[model samples]
Target: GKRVLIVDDAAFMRMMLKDIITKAGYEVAGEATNGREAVEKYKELKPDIVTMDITMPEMNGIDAIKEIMKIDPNAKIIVCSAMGQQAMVIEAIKAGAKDFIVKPFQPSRVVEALNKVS
Candidate 1:
């Protein structure tokens, strides 16, 4: 199955995304609540794609993206950001996020990104 690692501080955010991806016939390999955890999970799971939130404690999604890129130059990542966080989104892009989705968590948009990245 196509696998994804979900990285977000909000449990609710993670849950919502997991639901949509799984329902769309995608598998969530693992989940991370902080940026550091994201880096760890990325190594352990090495999921096909990643859904990364912009803000978190212990590290941030942009930082995690770069670390993952170091491991796999072709790592495919998608940034999930709230509106008004375009600044961070740009940084994430520079760090190598293949795409991004704005929050309010539109199921179709999320699915589209997941499909596009993988």
Candidate 2:
């Protein structure tokens, strides 16, 4: 199974994603509430994949993705954001994110994105 790092500012979102990812049988390398934490965790955990939120305190997903990409150019990141964040999602992808999922998470979409990225 792949190892994943889940990053989001809201505890609820983190919990929900963790539940979904774990249910899909992946090991959660760690969790992060902000982009800064996300970068740090990426270095520490070296997860096979990362689920990163677009908006967050302390660094925002785009910057985090840039930093993580610097650390590991091949890093696989999936941007997770609410609808209307298409600009940010594009920016994240340009920064090296592999895929994305809109919020109000649908299990199928989440699973599909994960599978596609994998």
Candidate 3:
């Protein structure tokens, strides 16, 4: 089982990811509402993997990925992004995110992305 951190500004999004990932037999190490919060939780929880949103109130996914990479060079991360954010998603991946999944979540896709990254 992997330790997962779900990051999103929306509570429902967090809950949805938590349920999906947890049910897949992955332990949800924590959740964060925004990028700064994500950065803080990354240190506190140190999850084996992270599902981070591309947009948020502060810091954003790419920057947060960079911050986490600074703290843990090998940090495994998956960006949960919207359909039109290909550029941002690419930036996140370049910044060290392991993979990505589209929003309006398809559970299979999420799990598949996680599997690919891990």
Error of 1 at 88 (Å): 1.1
Candidate RMSDs in Å, in order, are: 0.9, 0.9, 1.0
Tell me the RMSD of model 2 versus the true structure: 0.9
lDDT, candidate 2, 1-118, per-residue tens:
3899999999999899899888987888899989999988888889989999988987899999999999999888999989998988889998899889999899888988887777
Better of 1 and 2 by lDDT: 1
| TM-score order of candidates, top first | 1, 2, 3
**lDDT for each of the candidates?**
0.90, 0.90, 0.90
**TM-score per candidate, chains pooled:** 0.96, 0.96, 0.95
* Model 3 agreement with the true structure over 13-79: per-residue lDDT tens digits: 8888899998988999998988899999999998999999978996788899999999999899999
Highest-lDDT candidate:
1
Candidate 2 global TM-score: 0.96
The parts of candidate 1 lying over 4 Å away from their true place are none
| lDDT string, candidate 1, 50-83, tens digits | 9899889989998899999999899989999999
